[PDB]
Structure formats: C-alpha cells, structure tokens
Enzyme design. Structure first.
Site, PDB file in Angstrom:
ATOM      1  N   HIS A 168       0.873  -1.215   0.000  1.00  9.99           N
ATOM      2  CA  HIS A 168       0.000   0.000   0.000  1.00  9.99           C
ATOM      3  C   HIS A 168       0.890   1.239   0.000  1.00  9.99           C
ATOM      4  O   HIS A 168       0.907   1.962   1.003  1.00  9.99           O
ATOM      5  CB  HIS A 168      -1.022  -0.034   1.130  1.00  9.99           C
ATOM      6  CG  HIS A 168      -2.044  -1.095   0.928  1.00  9.99           C
ATOM      7  ND1 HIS A 168      -2.013  -2.279   1.638  1.00  9.99           N
ATOM      8  CD2 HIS A 168      -3.070  -1.199   0.060  1.00  9.99           C
ATOM      9  CE1 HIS A 168      -3.003  -3.059   1.242  1.00  9.99           C
ATOM     10  NE2 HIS A 168      -3.661  -2.424   0.275  1.00  9.99           N
ATOM     11  N   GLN A 180      -5.223 -17.428  -3.916  1.00 11.69           N
ATOM     12  CA  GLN A 180      -5.398 -16.586  -5.121  1.00 11.69           C
ATOM     13  C   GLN A 180      -6.611 -17.065  -5.917  1.00 11.69           C
ATOM     14  O   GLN A 180      -7.416 -16.220  -6.280  1.00 11.69           O
ATOM     15  CB  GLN A 180      -4.109 -16.589  -5.935  1.00 11.69           C
ATOM     16  CG  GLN A 180      -3.019 -15.746  -5.289  1.00 11.69           C
ATOM     17  CD  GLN A 180      -3.329 -14.266  -5.326  1.00 11.69           C
ATOM     18  OE1 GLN A 180      -3.693 -13.717  -6.354  1.00 11.69           O
ATOM     19  NE2 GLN A 180      -3.213 -13.600  -4.190  1.00 11.69           N
ATOM     20  N   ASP A 195      -8.333  -0.522  -7.940  1.00 15.53           N
ATOM     21  CA  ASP A 195      -7.648  -1.004  -6.721  1.00 15.53           C
ATOM     22  C   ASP A 195      -7.155  -2.429  -6.980  1.00 15.53           C
ATOM     23  O   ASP A 195      -6.041  -2.714  -6.606  1.00 15.53           O
ATOM     24  CB  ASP A 195      -8.567  -0.859  -5.510  1.00 15.53           C
ATOM     25  CG  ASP A 195      -7.897  -0.915  -4.165  1.00 15.53           C
ATOM     26  OD1 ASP A 195      -6.729  -0.520  -4.074  1.00 15.53           O
ATOM     27  OD2 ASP A 195      -8.580  -1.320  -3.211  1.00 15.53           O
TER      28      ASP A 195
HETATM   29  C1  LIG Z   1      -4.417  -7.352  -5.958  1.00 16.71           C
HETATM   30  C2  LIG Z   1      -4.855  -8.137  -4.753  1.00 16.71           C
HETATM   31  C3  LIG Z   1      -5.788  -7.592  -3.836  1.00 16.71           C
HETATM   32  C4  LIG Z   1      -6.173  -8.301  -2.748  1.00 16.71           C
HETATM   33  C5  LIG Z   1      -7.153  -7.787  -1.763  1.00 16.71           C
HETATM   34  N1  LIG Z   1      -5.617  -9.574  -2.576  1.00 16.71           N
HETATM   35  C6  LIG Z   1      -5.778 -10.573  -1.633  1.00 16.71           C
HETATM   36 BR1  LIG Z   1      -6.909 -10.494  -0.155  1.00 16.71          BR
HETATM   37  C7  LIG Z   1      -4.987 -11.609  -2.004  1.00 16.71           C
HETATM   38  C8  LIG Z   1      -4.718 -12.881  -1.269  1.00 16.71           C
HETATM   39  S1  LIG Z   1      -5.958 -14.189  -1.442  1.00 16.71           S
HETATM   40  C9  LIG Z   1      -5.240 -15.383  -0.377  1.00 16.71           C
HETATM   41  N2  LIG Z   1      -6.012 -16.175   0.407  1.00 16.71           N
HETATM   42  C10 LIG Z   1      -5.164 -16.987   1.138  1.00 16.71           C
HETATM   43  C11 LIG Z   1      -5.406 -18.008   2.055  1.00 16.71           C
HETATM   44  C12 LIG Z   1      -4.298 -18.616   2.611  1.00 16.71           C
HETATM   45  C13 LIG Z   1      -2.995 -18.252   2.246  1.00 16.71           C
HETATM   46  C14 LIG Z   1      -2.760 -17.264   1.313  1.00 16.71           C
HETATM   47  C15 LIG Z   1      -3.866 -16.623   0.755  1.00 16.71           C
HETATM   48  N3  LIG Z   1      -3.927 -15.609  -0.205  1.00 16.71           N
HETATM   49  N4  LIG Z   1      -4.300 -11.277  -3.156  1.00 16.71           N
HETATM   50  C16 LIG Z   1      -4.702 -10.061  -3.519  1.00 16.71           C
HETATM   51  N5  LIG Z   1      -4.331  -9.349  -4.602  1.00 16.71           N
HETATM   52 MG   LIG Z   2      -7.181   0.693   0.585  1.00 16.16          MG
HETATM   53 ZN   LIG Z   3      -5.634   0.326  -2.673  1.00 17.74          ZN
END
Ligand SMILES: Cc1cc(C)n2c(Br)c(CSc3nc4ccccc4[nH]3)nc2n1
Ligand SMILES: [Mg+2]
Ligand SMILES: [Zn+2]
Length: 319
Positions: free
Chosen positions: A70, A271, A219
């Site tokens: 961020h 992901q 975003d």
């Molecule tokens: C660009 C972007 C934005 C967000 C909000 N992201 C998020 Br939240 C993730 C991670 S999803 C995820 N779930 C998990 C469960 C266990 C271990 C790792 C994990 N990652 N990526 C984002 N990218």
């Molecule tokens: Mg934000």
């Molecule tokens: Zn943002």
C-alpha cells in the site's frame, strides 16, 4: 515539484499508457510525471494550476509509507487503471468526476500503515475508535483533505464552494468504495440492476454504484497485468500481509492463514479463491456496464488460468 513541471512523457510511452495492461513498474522516476500526463490528457491542462498540482502530487507521494504494497507505486497503478477506464468511457463522466476520480485514486490509500481494518478493530487502535466501519478508508479520505488544506496545495480553488463540496463527496464515496467489505453488496446490486435492465447512468444512485465498482476494478488491477507482473505484485501483497501476521504473533494473537508466512503453501489456492469470489465477478460486472473495459476481464481470466497452472504443478522459473 519544479522538475515535475518540466516533465515530458517519452513518445514510445504515449501509445502504451492508453492500454489497460500498461505496467508502470519499469518507469519509477516518471511516476509523478505519468500522473500529470494522465490528468492533462483526461481532465485537461486547465483542470488544476500546474504549480499546485505538482506541489499536491509530491505531498501525496511523501505521505505514502515505505510499506511493501500500500505504497506510492500502488497509488499511481490504481490512478493509471482509472485513466484507462475514463479515456475508454470519457463522455459518460463530467469534468468534475474525471478530476475527482484521478485524485481519489492517487490518494485512496494515503498514510496506509500496512495494517488491515481487522487488525485496527481487533486491537482497538485509536483509528477504529473514530472510524467504526471502513476504518483505513475514512482515514485515507481525512489525509486527502489535510493535504488539500496545505498552503499552495488547494488544487480545487478554481471551483465554486458548491462544486468544491461536490468534488469532496465524489472523492469521499470513491475512497470509501475501496473498502472491499462494501464491494460484495455493491456488485450484487449492480449485477441485478444490469440483468433486470433497470441500470440508468443518469440515475445518481446508479452512477455512485458504477463509480464504486470502477474504484474496486482499479484497486485490484494488479490481477489485470501480464502474468509475470501480477505474480511479482502478489509477492509485495504477501510481504505486507505476513508482516501483520508477525505483529499479531508478538501481541499473543494468531493470524488468518493469508497473513501467516508459515502457510505460504496455501497461496495458489488462496489466489484462486480471491479470483473466483472477488476479481472475476468485479471485472465481469464492470464489462457488462462499461463494454470498453473488457480487456481487464480477459487479462483477469488469463491470470486465473495461470494460478490454476501453478496449482496443478506446471509453472515456470521465478527471479
Ligand atoms: C491485488 C490483490 C488484492 C487483494 C485484496 N488480494 C488478496 Br486479499 C490476495 C490474497 S488471497 C489469499 N487467500 C489466502 C489463504 C491462505 C494463504 C494465502 C492466501 N492468499 N491477493 C490479492 N491481490
Ligand atoms: Mg485501501
Ligand atoms: Zn488500494
């Protein structure tokens, strides 16, 4: 600030910057200049006094912290996605909206500390006392207003008091909309409005929802880049999440798997879940409403197939 006023975008970039998949990554010295460029092409050279805009941009940069995700890079990335949506849908928006939205995007994560709304509310941080919902987002909006009230920074001084009040409400709603908690409900309503044929862009309530989904789409736009760029950004996202997890361990609280660096194996499936639940529905609904935004959806789908490839053990070398 002075240097910024003399910035010219190299001609090779003038073509590339109009494309959704454009990655600002390799041009770090030009990010402040890229923003001025995008404001000048979308909004116009007379939207802001050039000296105040450059002063504003450099204070916004100073007020993003050295956090893994961020940060300043993210702000300019999200602003560039908004630029591409606006250029592709220009006459659906007003000069006031174009102004508001490019500024909202640059400012939408101002003074981010690398800590989630969950952390701040679980640990009753003072920000969570003030701001009960959308905690960081209310803060980012407060920080934007603080920067606008600096001597030499009020880029909105060509406006009437009416229009000033209007542009602050566009920005407030746009920044608040980047609270992912609000996305789920926003997209469900938009999807229903669209399927039932009731969506009306001249309906201000509908327009506010469409703008909110544009804010989600911008975003999240790292997932709309070519695979190698998306994959590199995912590393920054986890660097930040895992540092929060580490800070919770210290404080006697165990973190969710996503923030636990000892659960890194669950990233690919994490992901997949993020793309299925958030990103694909987002760009799917945006493309229905703003058909020129289709490239975001196609790119998002490509990166989903790449995470599937990782899951079934078929990916290539990292560096
Ligand atoms: C660009 C972007 C934005 C967000 C909000 N992201 C998020 Br939240 C993730 C991670 S999803 C995820 N779930 C998990 C469960 C266990 C271990 C790792 C994990 N990652 N990526 C984002 N990218
Ligand atoms: Mg934000
Ligand atoms: Zn943002």
């Amino acid at each position: 600030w002075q240097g910024l006023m003399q910035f010219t975008l190299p001609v090779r970039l003038c073509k590339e910057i109009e494309l959704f998949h454009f990655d600002i990554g390799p041009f770090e010295n030009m990010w402040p200049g890229i923003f001025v460029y995008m404001v000048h092409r979308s909004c116009g050279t007379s939207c802001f006094e050039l000296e105040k805009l450059c002063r504003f941009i450099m204070s916004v940069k100073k007020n993003y912290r050295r956090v893994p995700y961020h940060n300043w890079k993210h702000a300019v990335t999200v602003a560039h996605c908004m630029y591409a949506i606006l250029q592709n849908n220009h006459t659906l928006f007003t000069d006031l909206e174009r102004k508001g939205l490019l500024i909202a995007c640059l400012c939408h994560d101002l003074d981010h500390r690398g800590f989630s709304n969950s952390y701040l509310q679980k640990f009753d941080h003072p920000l969570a006392a003030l701001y009960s919902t959308s905690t960081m987002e209310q803060h980012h909006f407060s920080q934007t207003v603080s920067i606008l009230q600096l001597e030499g920074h009020n880029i909105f001084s060509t406006l009437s008091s009416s229009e000033y009040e209007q542009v602050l409400e566009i920005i407030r709603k746009a920044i608040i909309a980047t609270d992912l908690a609000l996305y789920f409900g926003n997209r469900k309503q938009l999807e229903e409005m669209y399927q039932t044929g009731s969506l009306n862009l001249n309906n201000q309530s509908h327009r506010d929802r469409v703008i909110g989904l544009m804010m989600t789409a911008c975003d999240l736009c790292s997932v709309t880049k070519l695979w190698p760029v998306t994959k590199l950004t995912a590393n920054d996202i986890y660097a930040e999440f895992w540092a929060e997890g580490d800070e919770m361990k210290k404080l006697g609280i165990q973190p969710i798997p996503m923030m636990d660096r000892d659960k890194k194996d669950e990233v690919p499936q994490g992901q997949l879940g993020f793309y299925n639940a958030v990103a694909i529905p987002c760009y799917t609904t945006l493309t229905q409403i703003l058909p020129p935004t289709e490239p975001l959806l196609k790119a998002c789908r490509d990166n989903l197939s790449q995470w599937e490839k990782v899951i079934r053990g078929e990916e290539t070398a990292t560096w």
